[PDB]
Amino acid sequence: SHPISLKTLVQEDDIGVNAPIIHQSVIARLTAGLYPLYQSKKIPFEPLPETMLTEGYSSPVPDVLLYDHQTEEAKVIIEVCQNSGLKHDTSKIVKLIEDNAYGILEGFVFNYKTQQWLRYRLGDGGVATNSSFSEVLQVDLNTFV
Amino acid sequence: YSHPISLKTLVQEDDIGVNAPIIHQSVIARLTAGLYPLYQSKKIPFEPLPETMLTEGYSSPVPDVLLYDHQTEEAKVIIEVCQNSGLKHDTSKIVKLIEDNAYGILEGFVFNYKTQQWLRYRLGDGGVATNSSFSEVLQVDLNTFV
Numbered sequence: 001s002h003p004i005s006l007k008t009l010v011q012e013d014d015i016g017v018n019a020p021i022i023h024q025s026v027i028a029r030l031t032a033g034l035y036p037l038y039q040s041k042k043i044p045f046e047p048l049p050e051t052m053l054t055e056g057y058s059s060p061v062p063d064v065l066l067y068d069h070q071t072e073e074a075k076v077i078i079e080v081c082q083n084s085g086l087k088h089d090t091s092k093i094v095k096l097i098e099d100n101a102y103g104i105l106e107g108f109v110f111n112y113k114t115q116q117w118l119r120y121r122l123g124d125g126g127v128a129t130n131s132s133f134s135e136v137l138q139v140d141l142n143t144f145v
Numbered sequence: 146y147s148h149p150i151s152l153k154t155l156v157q158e159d160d161i162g163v164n165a166p167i168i169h170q171s172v173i174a175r176l177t178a179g180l181y182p183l184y185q186s187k188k189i190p191f192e193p194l195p196e197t198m199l200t201e202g203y204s205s206p207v208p209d210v211l212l213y214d215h216q217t218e219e220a221k222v223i224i225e226v227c228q229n230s231g232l233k234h235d236t237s238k239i240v241k242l243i244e245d246n247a248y249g250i251l252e253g254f255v256f257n258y259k260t261q262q263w264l265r266y267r268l269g270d271g272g273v274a275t276n277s278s279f280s281e282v283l284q285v286d287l288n289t290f291v
């Protein structure tokens with residue numbers, strides 16, 4: 001199990017200067033947790049951290065994405081809040097999914113301070129819900145953090 | 146675990162030279178993922194962290210992967226991932242981060258994914274890097290993960 005829980009890291013971050021470390025730790029946790037499912041062929045998409053969707057200056061760069069090498073598209077994206085709001089950042093992922101540019105089917109936002117998750121699925125009319133379950137991957141993403 | 150696509154295959158397939166962003170981040174993912182269970186199991190004491198700031202500000206260096214000592218709040222091992230065009234830069238960078246700064250870094254590595262070659266630099270080796278993938282700090286061959 002994790003040598004240091006997210007709860008402990010958050011409890012110890014009195015001045016808030018550890019936020020970047022905690023954020024990258026979540027990225028590490030998700031990437032490391034998902035990777036063996038990919039290598040074992042349980043999931044078809046490669047987990048990739050901090051990967052640009054395009055070469056544009058303004059390209060989105062999701063904290064974690066699930067990449068389909070065959071179609072050259074990200075199918076699931078995960079954003080970890082960092083000194084930012086869960087709700088705010090979710091309104092952002094919804095637009096990314098509903099504008100249909102990138103082939104993204106599902107998105108998540110995780111607030112590491114409260115360990116709360118929001119999910120959005122393409123086709124859900126712009127309304128997000130409180131879920132950590134990926135229907136694309138068939139896994140509970142909260143299990144990895 | 147075997148990698149579904151080898152780095153060799155990825156590079157072979159990118160004749161046209163436009164897939165560097167994906168290949169580079171895949172290397173980060175493989176190193177982070179490969180090392181993480183050693184940290185979880187307490188075989189190594191340092192957390193593998195991708196693209197993490199060494200210090201405060203937009204001035205901070207950000208190596209591709211580092212091994213973080215949560216007790217001293219320092220990176221003890223850093224890894225840069227490059228292709229040929231960045232090799233000279235990244236070799237100079239790891240030496241300077243280790244010898245011209247006080248970040249607590251004991252070892253640095255450059256992995257060139259185009260050639261799949263490793264270089265190592267150890268604090269105190271007088272600026273001279275060698276062609277090794279073995280971390281003495283971790284007692285681990287980093288090449289086993291890529």
Ligand code: NA
Pocket residue numbers: 169209225226227
């Ligand atoms: Na790099």
